[PDB]
């Protein structure tokens, strides 16, 4: 048995490498490095923070105050929020408008404050990739990001620019182009409690910036498709996911190194695993992330998977195969064009062309026990991760959001044992990158806010 001989010889090999618990167990170099550890400074940014907010089953779920404030902007795309240590929120749309909200009036719907709308006036007079230093967006703003301190919001989209606006007036303070032709930005994330931005640009590139210095730190390379989502916490690590290469990478940005995590679910072995006694299959494209803590994260796929990954395992720890359902099959009055229902039913091939909803938004509350998933099934899902950190489980649903969920994130309130949050979710009737979405089933372009309690 050749793989048995491989495992056996590898075991003998590791035993021989060990060859080349007592009462005294102290090692001189380890305790010397621990003396240097006692000598050093800056136990602030580099907390390898584990899950210290265990509250998944604690708070209420089923009776949230859900207000779906519809807004008149075609296809809202992103949502950025802010809390100091009054709270503002930000939305941005495919109609080239950024909009500031106040959200701190917690028991009611948010309040519009200020527009900032680019348009055809901001097309540059050059068509030349480094004099892209205009003051507004002329194409398809895809992402906003508020500063952790709140001086600025920074936004960008398919016009390959980063425009950083002031908070108090929504004015463009600085323009930083991405200096090449395909340099469309797709996701932005500040590292927490900082002034450092991580943008993920479709050149298979990740750009980093210091916003209050108007400088770019480091460009870091290495995905294989467009870097569709990004996520960061207080550590200088980052977690990006490229779309169709089906890998999620995490980046030690000062070292400029990474850990890659591929997928790897196969319907052959999965249907055999069920065949030991079923509509589930392989993977299209890993789409969204959120780093839950500094040892784990969660990925949202294109076949409706939500997966939970550790920092110490290439293959994922936990899967959840169907997370928002399978799409309604196309009707017999809109598949075939024959006359009889028998042939128009034969043109469905049974179950072979039922496609699942793909999770287009995922948000893990940082270091907490609970994350929120959203797609165009109409109902957001709330999941909590078990305390042994090897599984998660569906708590409840938030069914007042008709449309695609282009963004989810939460806003905190309450103290250490009694808490209430408003879950913002940007709702559109069209995916945040291309159109591709038919059967617009009662959708509206709005902000689904929910107020969850206890």
């Amino acid at each position: 048995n050749p793989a048995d001989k491989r495992r056996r010889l590898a075991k003998q090999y590791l035993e021989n490498l060990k060859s080349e618990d007592e009462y005294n167990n102290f090692d001189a170099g380890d305790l010397d490095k621990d003396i240097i550890a006692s000598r050093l400074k800056e136990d602030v940014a580099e907390q390898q923070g584990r899950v210290f907010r265990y509250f998944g089953d604690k708070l209420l779920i089923s009776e949230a105050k859900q207000s779906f404030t519809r807004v008149g902007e075609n296809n809202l795309t992103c949502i950025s929020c802010f809390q100091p240590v009054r709270l503002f929120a930000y939305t941005v749309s495919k109609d080239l408008q950024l909009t500031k909200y106040d959200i701190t009036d917690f028991s009611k719907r948010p309040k519009k404050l200020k527009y900032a709308k680019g348009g055809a006036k901001y097309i540059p007079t050059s068509k030349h990739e480094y004099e892209n230093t205009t003051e507004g967006h002329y194409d398809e703003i895809l992402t906003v990001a508020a500063s952790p301190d709140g001086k600025y919001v920074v936004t960008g989209g398919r016009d390959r620019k980063l425009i950083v606006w002031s908070t108090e007036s929504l004015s463009p303070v600085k323009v930083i182009p991405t200096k090449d032709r395909r340099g469309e930005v797709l996701s932005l994330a500040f590292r927490k409690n900082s002034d450092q931005l991580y943008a993920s640009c479709a050149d298979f590139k990740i750009r980093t910036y210091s916003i209050n210095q108007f400088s770019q730190l480091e460009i870091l390379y290495g995905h294989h498709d467009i870097v569709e989502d990004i996520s960061a916490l207080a550590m200088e690590r980052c977690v990006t996911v490229g779309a169709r290469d089906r890998t999620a990478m995490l980046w030690k940005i000062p070292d400029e190194t990474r850990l890659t995590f591929r997928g790897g679910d196969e319907p052959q072995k999965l249907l055999r695993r069920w065949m030991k006694e079923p509509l589930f299959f392989c993977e299209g494209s890993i789409d969204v992330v959120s780093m839950v803590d500094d040892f784990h994260f969660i990925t949202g796929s294109d076949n409706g998977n939500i997966c939970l990954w550790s920092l110490a395992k290439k293959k994922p720890i936990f899967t959840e195969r169907i997370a928002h359902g399978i799409l309604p099959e196309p009707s017999f009055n809109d598949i075939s064009g024959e006359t009889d229902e028998e042939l128009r039913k034969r043109q469905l091939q049974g179950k072979k062309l039922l496609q699942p909803f793909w999770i287009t938004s995922l948000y893990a509350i940082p270091y907490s026990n609970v994350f929120i998933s959203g797609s165009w099934s109409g109902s957001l899902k709330v999941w909590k991760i078990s305390d042994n950190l090897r599984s998660f489980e569906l708590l409840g649903e938030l069914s007042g959001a008709k449309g695609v969920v282009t963004k989810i994130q939460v806003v905190e309130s309450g103290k250490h044992g009694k808490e209430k949050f408003r879950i913002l979710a940007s709702i559109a009737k069209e995916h945040r990158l291309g159109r591709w979405i038919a059967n617009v089933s009662g959708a509206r372009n709005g902000i689904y806010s929910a107020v969850i309690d206890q």
Binding site: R244, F281, C282, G284, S285, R346, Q349, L353
Partner: protein, 121 residues
């Protein structure tokens, strides 16, 4: 036998869609039904992908007869939305074609997908 007969399963579908995305980046993909039939009657096509769930189905079933005439592999992907997303355009496509090129950096991948869908067909 349905009309959209030689459908691919999920592993072959993702192999097809990955090489479709790479050919679309390398300008070797002609996307859409009448561009596909144009490149098919011109003879610069290595295999055609039709999506088996558009709102009519004969709208692209016109193409298997052309592929049969000129001996070109044809395969049915079960999602027009995923096919357009792989093609890299902001709309669903119902048919696409991989044009022939010998200064092409993905020729081995295209030939492997051609062999897989031809043993299917």
């Amino acid at each position: 036998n349905p009309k959209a007969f030689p459908l691919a399963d999920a592993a072959l579908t993702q192999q097809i869609l990955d090489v479709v995305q790479q050919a679309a980046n390398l300008r070797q993909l002609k996307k859409g039904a009448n561009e596909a039939t144009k490149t098919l009657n011109r003879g610069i096509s290595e295999f055609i992908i039709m999506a088996a769930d558009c709102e009519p189905i004969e709208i692209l079933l016109h193409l298997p007869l052309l592929c049969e005439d000129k001996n070109v592999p044809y395969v049915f992907v079960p999602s027009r939305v995923a096919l357009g997303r792989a093609c890299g355009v902001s709309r669903p496509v119902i048919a696409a074609s991989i044009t022939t090129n010998d200064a092409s950096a993905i020729k081995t991948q295209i030939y492997a997908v051609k062999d897989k869908i031809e043993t299917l067909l």
